[model samples]
Target: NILSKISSFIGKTFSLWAALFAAAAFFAPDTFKWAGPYIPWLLGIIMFGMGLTLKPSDFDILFKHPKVVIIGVIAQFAIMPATAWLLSKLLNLPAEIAVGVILVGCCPGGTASNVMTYLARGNVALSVAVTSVSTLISPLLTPAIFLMLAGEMLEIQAAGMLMSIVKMVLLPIVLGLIVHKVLGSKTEKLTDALPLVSVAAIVLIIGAVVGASKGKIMESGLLIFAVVVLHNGIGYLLGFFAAKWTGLPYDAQKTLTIEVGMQNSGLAAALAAAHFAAAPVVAVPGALFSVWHNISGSLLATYWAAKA
Candidate 1:
């Protein structure tokens, strides 16, 4: 009962926790830098927790009317990448940072978006489906779009990235589902605790990303911060209008908004670190994105949650 109450409080105040922890890392970057190495594992564990809480009922919306999911998925792929391209060019950023911004946009909607949808009390079902579909499709689009937009500046290993997604995202969610099936009602309390865990994990992700690139934050941080904020905020606006223009319901509209706004920048940062070592600065945009979106999404979720 105490844990349930604690979890509820954390869930309701998700945005504050995300902001406070991100600022904590930003202020004392060295303290949380180690979290960078554990980002993937931390993400896996959060997905595992999601799987534990999964109910077949959560996906019924997708099964019954697939149109919304398709629309949301297409928007998820379309809005952010195009926005990234526009912003990167409009800002006249250096090639390395421009590629970074485009990469973040080109990647799929993030795993964190589902939880933000839950916190926002939007159609979490729609959010989850859109994320999975986009993620599954990412290996092709992420690289292809990157090549089309920033080919002269960068490269990505599609198969390698694909395999990592399978391991990091898909498998964990699948295994969590199986585990939940096996345990049944025993997981009810565990599910309650998940919000706290999920929130904590996402906060740690921001810390890790921000911490790893503290120096860059001190340098080009101001410019990219403005760019990411502009890019992220525009995604939310256009995504909401995209769904609204399509005459989607309120919940579907919010789901698309959050889904399009929050991206898998962690994947972008990891790829930059691994492949684009020649320009380590290429990862800074991804790092800043990882920090900002969570804060913005959580704040938006908080606003939407209360509006209901």
Candidate 2:
């Protein structure tokens, strides 16, 4: 019972935790910089935790509503990247920030979306299905989209980016699935602790990135902050209307909106840090996004939940 209460509190207050950690990192970069090098491994831990929480049944929704899943996935990949690219060009975002913004956009739908969907009284099953499928394919899609869109800004090593993702993202998830398969019921209690584990990992990631980008944050902090907000807000608008135009149910629309709007900014941070070594500032947008999405998502979900 104590564990359940702890988990519930952590789950309910994820956004607050993210913002608090982000602020701490901004104020005290040195305290968080110790987490910098381990960022990829930290992300791996989160992905593995996700794999452990996943069920074969989560994928069943895809088969049942193939059309819906396909549409959501398309919108998730299409809307965010396009919006990021368009915004970067239209706003004439500085090189480093532009790449960072586009990188976050190119990432897969985050695990956070499923929780937000449930809170919003949206179709959690569809949300889970979309997140799962999008994450599984992210190693390829994330790199390709980033290279295609960000090529002109800087020299993007697609192969290195792909390899980084495979090792950091895909491998850990596969291991998590294997662990789940072997442990099964024996790990029920461990599974229950995943939210706390995931949140801890993600919070550290945000702090580390923000700390590492301290100079960038101060120099372009306001500008980058504004860009990230617009990117995410516009993404929500486009994704919802895209689903609406497709004649999806209202709940499905909510799922699509959340999924597309909230990206795997953790992955973007890791990738940018690893591949774009010349541009340390390139990871700031992802770090800022990690903080903003949770705040905005919780607010959106609460509003929708009240309406429902």
Candidate 3:
């Protein structure tokens, strides 16, 4: 009971903590830069937590409603990348920033989206299924999408990026699954702790990137921030209407909204640092994205939940 309450508290207040850490990192870059190298591992921790939460039931939605899953995945891969490219062009984003935006766009739906889906009284099953499928396929899709969209602006080593995704995303998730299998009932007991652990990891990841790119952020932070806001805001709109256009019910529409609008930005940040290490600034958008989306997603979840 105590753990449940604690987890609930942390989940409800994630946005505030994220914003606070981001500001702290911005002001005290040196304090958080040490976390740069651990970004991937931190993401691993989050993914592992994700794995521990997985249920056999979560996968049933795929077989029961294949079309809904397919549409959600297509919208996820299509809308975000296209929107990122459009924003990059229309905003005249600098090369690195453009790549950064696209990298985040290419990422899978975030684990946090499930939480948002639950909060919004949406189709939590659909949300979890989409997030799981999108994430599993991301190693192939993320690199391909990034290379196609951002090749002109930056030198993208698709092969290397693919490997990075497998290491950072796939391997950890697999490990998490194994842990869940072996631990079984004991694993479920720790579910309450997982959210708090995930929250801490994400906050640190965001702070580390922000701290590492403090100077760069100062130079173009406002513009990049604007781009992130537009990208995330428009994503929500497109995702919701796309689901509606397909004649999905209200719950499925809400699920798609969270799925499309939120992204695995931590993965994007980790990949950016690994592949684009030469330009640390490239990770800034992902970091900023980590902060903005949670705040926005929470607000939307609350609004939709109330309406429902």
Candidate 4:
């Protein structure tokens, strides 16, 4: 009972914890620098928690009404990355930081987006479907586009990036799915504790990543922070318009807006940590995104639901 209470607190105040510890790491890089090696595993653990909530029914909307889901995916990939690519060039961000920004775009909808949609009086079913489908295909989609935009930035082995997503993300989600199936009702109790574990990993990653390249952050941290706001804010509009342009209901429009605006930046950061280890700054956008959009989306949900 005590644990669940604490878990709910952490779950409810997710943004504050992320911001606080992210600052902790930024201020005292050495505190979390050692955690860098475990970044990949941290994300795996979060993915496992995500899987706990997922069931066969999660994808029902995907197949039942493919139109909205399909359009959401298209805008997720199209509107987000296109804005990132343009914003990076428009601002002339450092190539290293630019890669981080684009990588944020490359990733799919995150687990948090579903929660945001729920808070916003939007369609949780549609959000879940969109997140599931986009993530399922991310191993292929994330890196190729990353390569397309920034292959020359560091000439990454796009081939290897594929398997890294499999190892770091997909495999854990699959494992989480298995554990839930095996444990059945026991998983429900475990879900209460999940917020604690998931937040711990993400917060640690924020520290490790920010610590990894505080210098780049010092030089261009403000600049890149500006980039994250612009791209993500732009993403919200473009994403909303995409769903709007396609003629969906208000519920679907709100869902698409949050999904596209908020990304799985945790996974984006993890990809940078796993693959771009040599260039620690590449993870910065992911860290910044990890910190910012949750707050933005949280407010969005509040404002949206207030009207309803």
Best by lDDT: 3
Best by TM-score: 4
TM-score of each: 0.83, 0.96, 0.95, 0.96
TM-score, predicted candidate 1 vs. hidden true structure: 0.83
| C-alpha lDDT score of every prediction, in listed order | 0.79, 0.88, 0.89, 0.87
lDDT of 2 by residue, 1-308 (tens): 88789879877887788888989999999989898888998998998888888778888889888999999999998999999999999999887788899899999998889989999999999999999899999878888888889884444466687888888888888888778788887768778777888888888988988888888888898998898889889989999999999999999999899999998898988888888866878888888888888888888889999999
Candidate 1 vs candidate 3: the TM-score winner is 3
Candidate 3 lDDT (Cα, whole model)?
Answer: 0.89
- Candidate 4 Cα misplacement greater than 4 A, ranges: 152-155
Cα error of candidate 1 at position 204, Å: 3.4
Report the lDDT tens digits of candidate 3 across residue range 1-308: 88779778777888778888989988888877888889889998888788777767778989999999999999999999999999999988999899899999998999889989999999989999999999989999998888889884444466677888888788878787778888887887677677788888888898988888888998999998999999999999999999999999999999999999999998889988888887888888898898889989999999998898
Write model 1 residue lDDT over 177-201, tens digit each, in one string: 8888888888886777677776776
lDDT of 4 by residue, 128-218 (tens): 9999889989999888777887765545556777998899878988888888888887888888777888899999999999998988888
lDDT of candidate model 1 versus the reference: 0.79
Worst 10 residues of 3 by lDDT: 152-161
**What value does the lDDT take at residue 254 in candidate 2?**
91
Clashes of each: 0, 0, 0, 0
